[PDB]
Design an enzyme around this catalytic site. Structure first.
Site, PDB file in Angstrom:
ATOM      1  N   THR E  14       0.869  -1.173   0.000  1.00 21.21           N
ATOM      2  CA  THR E  14       0.000   0.000   0.000  1.00 21.21           C
ATOM      3  C   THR E  14       0.904   1.220   0.000  1.00 21.21           C
ATOM      4  OG1 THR E  14      -1.557  -1.269   1.343  1.00 21.21           O
ATOM      5  CG2 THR E  14      -2.027   1.059   1.006  1.00 21.21           C
ATOM      6  N   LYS E  16       2.428   4.737   0.566  1.00 19.49           N
ATOM      7  CA  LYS E  16       2.342   5.650   1.692  1.00 19.49           C
ATOM      8  C   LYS E  16       3.117   6.905   1.328  1.00 19.49           C
ATOM      9  CE  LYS E  16       0.063   2.621   3.814  1.00 19.49           C
ATOM     10  NZ  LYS E  16      -1.254   2.814   4.425  1.00 19.49           N
ATOM     11  N   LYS E  42      -0.881  -0.865  -4.609  1.00 19.68           N
ATOM     12  CA  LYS E  42      -2.275  -0.528  -4.427  1.00 19.68           C
ATOM     13  C   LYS E  42      -2.497   0.919  -4.035  1.00 19.68           C
ATOM     14  CE  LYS E  42      -5.339  -1.631  -0.864  1.00 19.68           C
ATOM     15  NZ  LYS E  42      -5.354  -0.381  -0.087  1.00 19.68           N
ATOM     16  N   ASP E  44      -4.340   3.321  -1.622  1.00 19.79           N
ATOM     17  CA  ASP E  44      -4.952   3.306  -0.298  1.00 19.79           C
ATOM     18  C   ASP E  44      -6.457   3.518  -0.426  1.00 19.79           C
ATOM     19  OD1 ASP E  44      -4.387   2.878   2.414  1.00 19.79           O
ATOM     20  OD2 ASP E  44      -2.835   4.429   2.412  1.00 19.79           O
ATOM     21  N   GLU E  45      -7.207   3.021   0.556  1.00 18.79           N
ATOM     22  CA  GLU E  45      -8.660   3.028   0.437  1.00 18.79           C
ATOM     23  C   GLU E  45      -9.217   4.447   0.327  1.00 18.79           C
ATOM     24  OE1 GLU E  45      -7.262   2.190   3.620  1.00 18.79           O
ATOM     25  OE2 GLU E  45      -7.817   4.203   4.311  1.00 18.79           O
ATOM     26  N   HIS E 135     -11.728  -3.622  -0.467  1.00 19.67           N
ATOM     27  CA  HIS E 135     -11.325  -3.111   0.839  1.00 19.67           C
ATOM     28  C   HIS E 135     -12.535  -3.042   1.764  1.00 19.67           C
ATOM     29  CE1 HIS E 135      -9.467  -0.263   3.731  1.00 19.67           C
ATOM     30  NE2 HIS E 135      -8.319  -0.704   3.248  1.00 19.67           N
ATOM     31  N   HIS E 168     -10.046  -8.114   2.074  1.00 16.29           N
ATOM     32  CA  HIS E 168      -9.207  -8.001   3.250  1.00 16.29           C
ATOM     33  C   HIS E 168      -9.774  -8.881   4.355  1.00 16.29           C
ATOM     34  CE1 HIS E 168      -6.349  -4.488   2.557  1.00 16.29           C
ATOM     35  NE2 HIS E 168      -6.965  -4.641   1.398  1.00 16.29           N
ATOM     36  N   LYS E 175      -1.554  -4.759  13.347  1.00 12.34           N
ATOM     37  CA  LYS E 175      -2.048  -3.680  14.194  1.00 12.34           C
ATOM     38  C   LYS E 175      -3.556  -3.692  14.388  1.00 12.34           C
ATOM     39  CE  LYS E 175      -2.235  -0.360  10.381  1.00 12.34           C
ATOM     40  NZ  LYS E 175      -1.407   0.538   9.536  1.00 12.34           N
ATOM     41  N   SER E 220      -3.205  -7.526   5.669  1.00 12.40           N
ATOM     42  CA  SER E 220      -2.606  -6.202   5.603  1.00 12.40           C
ATOM     43  C   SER E 220      -2.752  -5.515   6.958  1.00 12.40           C
ATOM     44  CB  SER E 220      -3.271  -5.370   4.497  1.00 12.40           C
ATOM     45  OG  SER E 220      -2.561  -4.176   4.249  1.00 12.40           O
TER      46      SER E 220
HETATM   47  O1  LIG Z   1      -4.540   1.797   5.832  1.00 11.88           O
HETATM   48  C1  LIG Z   1      -3.852   0.826   6.187  1.00 11.88           C
HETATM   49  O2  LIG Z   1      -3.395   0.856   7.347  1.00 11.88           O
HETATM   50  C2  LIG Z   1      -3.553  -0.307   5.211  1.00 11.88           C
HETATM   51  O3  LIG Z   1      -3.366   0.297   3.903  1.00 11.88           O
HETATM   52  C3  LIG Z   1      -2.286  -1.033   5.659  1.00 11.88           C
HETATM   53  O4  LIG Z   1      -1.250  -0.099   5.810  1.00 11.88           O
HETATM   54  P1  LIG Z   1       0.171  -0.644   6.277  1.00 11.88           P
HETATM   55  O5  LIG Z   1       0.536  -1.800   5.367  1.00 11.88           O
HETATM   56  O6  LIG Z   1       1.194   0.479   6.256  1.00 11.88           O
HETATM   57  O7  LIG Z   1      -0.044  -1.146   7.681  1.00 11.88           O
HETATM   58  C4  LIG Z   1      -4.693  -1.305   5.033  1.00 11.88           C
HETATM   59  O8  LIG Z   1      -5.786  -0.646   4.445  1.00 11.88           O
HETATM   60  C5  LIG Z   1      -5.150  -1.963   6.322  1.00 11.88           C
HETATM   61  O9  LIG Z   1      -4.282  -3.027   6.625  1.00 11.88           O
HETATM   62  C6  LIG Z   1      -6.543  -2.532   6.100  1.00 11.88           C
HETATM   63  O10 LIG Z   1      -6.950  -3.222   7.258  1.00 11.88           O
HETATM   64  P2  LIG Z   1      -8.001  -4.441   7.203  1.00 11.88           P
HETATM   65  O11 LIG Z   1      -7.342  -5.584   6.436  1.00 11.88           O
HETATM   66  O12 LIG Z   1      -8.332  -4.802   8.643  1.00 11.88           O
HETATM   67  O13 LIG Z   1      -9.292  -4.027   6.538  1.00 11.88           O
HETATM   68 MN   LIG Z   2      -5.088   1.629   3.505  1.00  8.41          MN
END
Ligand SMILES: O=C(O)[C@@](O)(COP(=O)(O)O)[C@H](O)[C@H](O)COP(=O)(O)O
Ligand SMILES: [Mn+2]
Ligand SMILES: O=C(O)[C@@](O)(COP(=O)(O)O)[C@H](O)[C@H](O)COP(=O)(O)O
Ligand SMILES: O=C(O)[C@@](O)(COP(=O)(O)O)[C@H](O)[C@H](O)COP(=O)(O)O
Ligand SMILES: [Mn+2]
Ligand SMILES: [Mn+2]
Lengths: 467, 123, 467, 151, 316, 123
Positions: E14, E16, E42, E44-45, E135, E168, E175, E220
């Site tokens: 993802t 950043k 990807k 990010d959402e 997502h 997901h 975390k 993730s």
């Molecule tokens: O926004 C975030 O934190 C992530 O892009 C991960 O970032 P990192 O890889 O930097 O941690 C993912 O969307 C979450 O893992 C989704 O969680 P889930 O799978 O529970 O829906």
């Molecule tokens: Mn994300």
């Protein structure tokens, strides 16, 4: 509560002059240079402008009682007399946000500028500046791509972008039009230009020109290895035709098209700008007719008002004046509205023409374009006045070289790059500009040729619009 | 009248039409980068030194705009020398690669400098 | 045929001042009022204006030899000193037909007024008139319907038509807009209209307005037995939105829509004119922002030009001023551009502002619309200035009446029919107008009440653009 | 002015807790009722909510040097404890306007309310009120007709 | 089959910081991540179309980047371009341009986008050969607490019906909250044709999917290379592992950060194929690989003692 | 900070980022294949080692995913040495071909294993 309807004319000042008013942050604010006819109080003149641009008319109408006029009325919240002038005033009008249609520069001008300038009671009227609130700004799409994305899409950093405008303005065939573009582009000029008056005509039809200009720009790009554009003119009589030209340029994969937004109108320009956003196409804006509106101090609209509108309507480039070229350009006025087009925030600067502080809530920037009567000697001044984020256009300068286009392009490319080096190394361009040009002639056969042809050429006429 | 050459006249954007840079001239450029407080970074490419179109013909799309990044943008760099040694390390590892020095503005998130700094042989 | 290339800056008069030339019938002719900067010869000014509005650039370009420039170049062929003014000349320019795109008012203005008005060499520039050749006139569709078909469609003969602008300009609700329209139309008015700035807004969205205005219009038609219309504004920020409003009106089956052709643009206006002819819809054109361009004699573009541009682009109505009203209109100049809008042939008359003889090869007439600060005492004079082929629009005049809209509409219709009756019996509306109004107050209380309110209200100011 | 990149996890509070900050009228504000897990300071939880709703992740990334994170970061500007509660606090988060897509409630919810509610360090999370700026309001069409037009 | 990737979990990143990047820096970041050995990058959402980055520019730059990396690696690369939007029209315009680009994968957030738009998009991806990565954003507003809401297994079955090629699933060790036995249960519901009722795993009913394809679980959220043996052993080869902070936080950069995660995963796959137990030998398998791989060896030193251990709000 | 190579660093999907496989390591993978009751097959390509898009640009479409099959899938193969012997046979008939080993699961109808068994010189 409500007040009885009483039919008859009343003075505008009774409801529309409001010196007590504290401007809301959502209001559109307008700075008018007002010249009343004899016998007209300044307060009545300012209240007349605000009335007939918002909610009022010449006599009292009963229907006012169905609405809450105090909520919707345009108001004159300040009158300031002009220096060295008698019977000329600067009147500030605030318009509520509800008066305005979202996303329409057309509507905004229709209200603010639609009938006021014709009033018998005013000797003259000029709109100097508009403060567009951020909440209205958000409703417009703005430049399709903007300064950052355009540099990123063209992969061109560290200097002003360079262009030439094909001449003669009209009369060239399509094949010859293209042959000119390749020769210009191979010499190092980033852009070639359709002239603003070149649409589709008996001498050159638009599709043939589009096709031939495409071949020429790609061949030049392969030889140079540097990305190249040629602005194709979508300006047309109908929207259908405008779109047709925009779709073909999308079929060709070329990067940039152009529009004359004032002669095409805002409605068409917004439509094109929305098409360019959707198809990845850069949109270059030509300001034809602006001088009919903006040349005179006493009457008209200042270009800073029209430049703002194009940023809201949409364009990646907008012609800005050269200061040093054939068409009128005032350094301090230009420097103000080049910032209004380029940056997010501009403080009110009466010395630079800015009557209100304007913020663009991250609306992308417009690339200022300098064109018209400029040659290689002008390059140091240009590079300093406008900075890296600009486009320099040398139509006469490129096609006026005695060795040809490809040499004429090298001269302007060598000039700018040599100017750019100096500024990077700490030399002052204004002081040493000619000495920097002169060193370049020693190592550059092409630039030398250019320099002797235009050494004595300068445009130095007294200006008609001063702050 | 002189005819501009057709062949082997590929160019390298800003300062490429200018005569080739002395080590002093390159240093003055990176001094201009650092004094503006932009963040220096170095990019190398071997296979595709000039732009091409392979995968799409859409407007605004080209290949070869992306070059490979040498290490990471030197955030917190006040020293032109550190930039200059970094160019040397890239060259030793990539002698056949084109190499360019760029500068990032965080406020506008646009590269504010790009110039070629090393070319492979023949170029 | 071929002459050498010398790179250099020449005087424009070397190529672009041709006092011997005989104007072809296919040429577009222009009358520019040119005010040179001190120390520029009048011949250089004329040539500069002709050159950078046609095929010329600041320095000599080698491509000029590729084309036959003498075939395509604009020409300054007559220079006339403007008496009473030093350093002012009327410069006549001819433009070859091939320079213009067929059917594009946009293109025509872009060449003729695009860049020249900002040249440093000229203190000021004004385009006073254009001669448009019949062969170019035939390329435009012109008004969608025109004077004859609109009288036939509405079954309205023998009098000026009657209109009313709904007030307050902004801030009424859609439903109150309709209740306003119904009462205005049931009292004998033919038309009501949206104000020029009423598009779609947070206080009133358009589809609601259109829907309510349709009901009111039809209720009024059933009660009166007389065909009724409400101009629905289609002006918008984009052409997609402009069409969406036009399409719904067609579904509603209403007779007439309106557009602001300067603030919306000539490109979108030509689009809209073609949809109107295609769907049998009348086009009423508001001239919003013309006075920024045309108020002043020294600089800009006179309304005659923009009024001709509209006849080509297309509109069934166009605001023409009132002479007697609150907005500036000089009788003699207004009479001239009225015949330019209404008639097939107009011979040149400097006394009425007409610099050239213009023919329209059966392009239909445009119905001139007088609006703004006119009341029942102005009716005798309005009937006299404009004749039967006009529309008389009273906004404040209807809604400002003390008894309401329907009585206010009866006053204006009554005032008009008494003027038509007396004119037809041979009386001089100029001398006898007040006697006719007073006579009609004896049997119409509605008129009697309107007359007491406005009896002293006049608009009498010194003009800014007389002949 | 750049700061050197250092890889590794840092506390959320250093970058995203800003009790000093003064909210702009363009900012979206959100009132979160926060219940941190045992041993999690309220400032860390409020700053974790802001970071993971706007521009943050669990460890330091180099790409932060290309952007101006301070202009784009969401900030916990205020923390107030809840009456009658222990380890429950009302955290106020300010998000800049540029983070949000015009006219999209989907985007507004995906950032503010997208992932924060699943964080392990949190026992519970509630979003109580949103202060939507007027500049964001203007991007939306809103009701097709509304109360007046409906009557 | 379409991507020609067999025998291991797929690797993603993802990009950043979550918001604020320009389109071009998004693409440099995508190319560097993809060339180091990651299969997927990807959006990010929350990244849709914004003042800092407009989508069409993103889609184009990310397209050039994944093609550069795919050309030099010899391996098919994909970037999930976010189609989530305010209206179905905007959603379609985004999915339509992805198809013109010939890219392999698009993404939707189905709970903030909603089920009606998601089934529309699912039907478009089938019609046009596009993979759909889902997502689950806003789920935890619904499914964190035991007393109130819906469990995510209901929402997971709903996505398999609505339509998605990825969903997901949670990391368990990362975390965000996930209990190993519960996550194992709804993963079986996402991947297999039949799941018997298992109250220990939160399965209250026997469910049959009547040959509806399975969905790839995606792990993730706050995971790094030391979490890799545990993810591989939990989720098996049919999964996607997504390292955002794990790649972009690497001290040498994204390409080295990609190589760390690709090396780590393949060292676990080899060890598992050789018969070693990932739960028991996980630290030694990563550590043995650090001797030959400097990129793996650097990342380990940075994320050594980083764990996420807290009480769970919803256990069986 | 070490920069990942950009030239000649072609990769071969699973295990290719690991150190090169010893003959014992290759046997281990074949045993993992056989113990999982997956069918072993051998696949070789000479012309195009890596993926390309000559014929179409459609989403999901790539060229070069398919390779040529060596003999048939070895159904009912209980012995790891057959796969090994077949590899040496494929190698001797096609020395300049990449060769890879694939594992078929009948129940999911997907390959569960694919790894590159042999690379020709220059690779
Ligand atoms: O926004 C975030 O934190 C992530 O892009 C991960 O970032 P990192 O890889 O930097 O941690 C993912 O969307 C979450 O893992 C989704 O969680 P889930 O799978 O529970 O829906
Ligand atoms: Mn994300
Ligand atoms: O047609 C022209 O004159 C130009 O192409 C310049 O000519 P050269 O390049 O040959 O000098 C420009 O469009 C003018 O500058 C327009 O004026 P402005 O900048 O005010 O919009
Ligand atoms: O907006 C207005 O003020 C009017 O509706 C008149 O209002 P009233 O009828 O209420 O006075 C007309 O548009 C103006 O006459 C403009 O006139 P034009 O362009 O013809 O000069
Ligand atoms: Mn031009
Ligand atoms: Mn009006």
């Amino acid at each position: 509560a409500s007040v009885e309807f009483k039919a008859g004319v009343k003075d505008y000042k009774l409801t529309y002059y409001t010196p007590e008013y504290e401007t809301l942050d959502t209001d559109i604010l307008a700075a008018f240079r007002v010249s009343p006819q004899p016998g007209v109080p300044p307060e009545e003149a300012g209240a007349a402008v605000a009335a007939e641009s918002s909610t009022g008319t010449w006599t009292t109408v009963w229907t006012d009682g169905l609405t809450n006029l105090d909520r919707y009325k345009g108001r004159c919240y300040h009158i300031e007399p002009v220096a060295g002038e008698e019977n000329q005033y600067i009147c500030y009008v605030a318009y509520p946000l509800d008066l305005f249609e979202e996303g329409s520069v057309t509507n905004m001008f229709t209200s603010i500028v639609g009938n006021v300038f014709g009033f018998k009671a005013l000797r003259a009227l000029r709109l100097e500046d508009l403060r567009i609130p951020v909440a209205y700004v958000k409703t417009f799409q703005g430049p399709p791509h903007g300064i950052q994305v355009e540099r990123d899409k063209l992969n061109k950093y560290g200097r002003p972008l360079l262009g030439c405008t094909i001449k003669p303005k009209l009369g060239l065939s399509a094949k010859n039009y293209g042959r000119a573009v390749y020769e210009c582009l191979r010499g190092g000029l980033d852009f070639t230009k359709d002239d603003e008056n070149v649409n589709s005509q008996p001498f050159m039809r638009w599709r043939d020109r589009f096709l031939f200009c495409a071949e020429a720009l790609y061949k030049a790009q392969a030889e140079t290895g540097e990305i190249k554009g040629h602005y194709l003119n979508a300006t047309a009589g109908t929207c259908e035709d405008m779109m047709k030209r925009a779709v073909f340029a999308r079929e060709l994969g070329v990067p940039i098209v152009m529009h004359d937004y004032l002669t095409g109108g805002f409605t068409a320009n917004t439509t094109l700008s929305h098409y360019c956003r959707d198809n990845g196409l850069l949109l270059h804006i030509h300001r034809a007719m602006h001088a009919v509106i903006d040349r005179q101090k006493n009457h008209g609209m200042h270009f800073r008002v029209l430049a703002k509108a194009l940023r809201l309507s949409g364009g990646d480039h907008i012609h800005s004046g050269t200061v040093v070229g054939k068409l009128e350009g005032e350094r301090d006025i230009t420097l103000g509205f080049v910032d209004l087009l380029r940056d997010d925030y501009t403080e009110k600067d009466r010395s630079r023409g800015i009557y209100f502080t304007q913020s663009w809530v991250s609306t992308p920037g417009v690339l200022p374009v300098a064109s018209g009567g400029i040659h290689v000697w002008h390059m140091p001044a240009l590079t300093e006045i406008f900075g890296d984020d600009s486009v320099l256009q040398f139509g006469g300068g490129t096609l006026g070289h005695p060795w040809g286009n490809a040499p004429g392009a090298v001269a302007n490319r060598v000039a700018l790059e040599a100017c750019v080096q100096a500024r990077n190394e700490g030399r002052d361009l204004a002081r040493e500009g000619n000495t920097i040009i002169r060193e370049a002639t020693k190592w550059s056969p092409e630039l030398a040729a250019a320099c002797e042809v235009w050494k004595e050429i300068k445009f130095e006429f007294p200006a008609m619009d001063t702050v | 009248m002189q005819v501009w050459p057709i062949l082997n006249l590929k160019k390298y954007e800003t300062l490429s039409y200018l005569p080739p840079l002395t080590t002093d001239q390159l240093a003055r450029q990176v001094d201009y980068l650092l004094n503006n407080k932009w963040v220096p970074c170095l990019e190398f490419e071997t296979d595709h030194g000039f732009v091409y179109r392979e995968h799409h013909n859409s407007p605004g799309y080209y290949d070869g705009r992306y070059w490979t990044m040498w290490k990471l943008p030197m955030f917190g760099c006040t020293d032109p020398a550190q930039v200059l040694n970094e160019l040397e390390e890239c060259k030793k590892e990539y002698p056949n690669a084109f190499i360019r020095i760029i500068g990032f503005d965080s406020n506008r998130e646009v590269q504010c400098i790009s110039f070629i700094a090393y070319k492979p042989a023949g170029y």
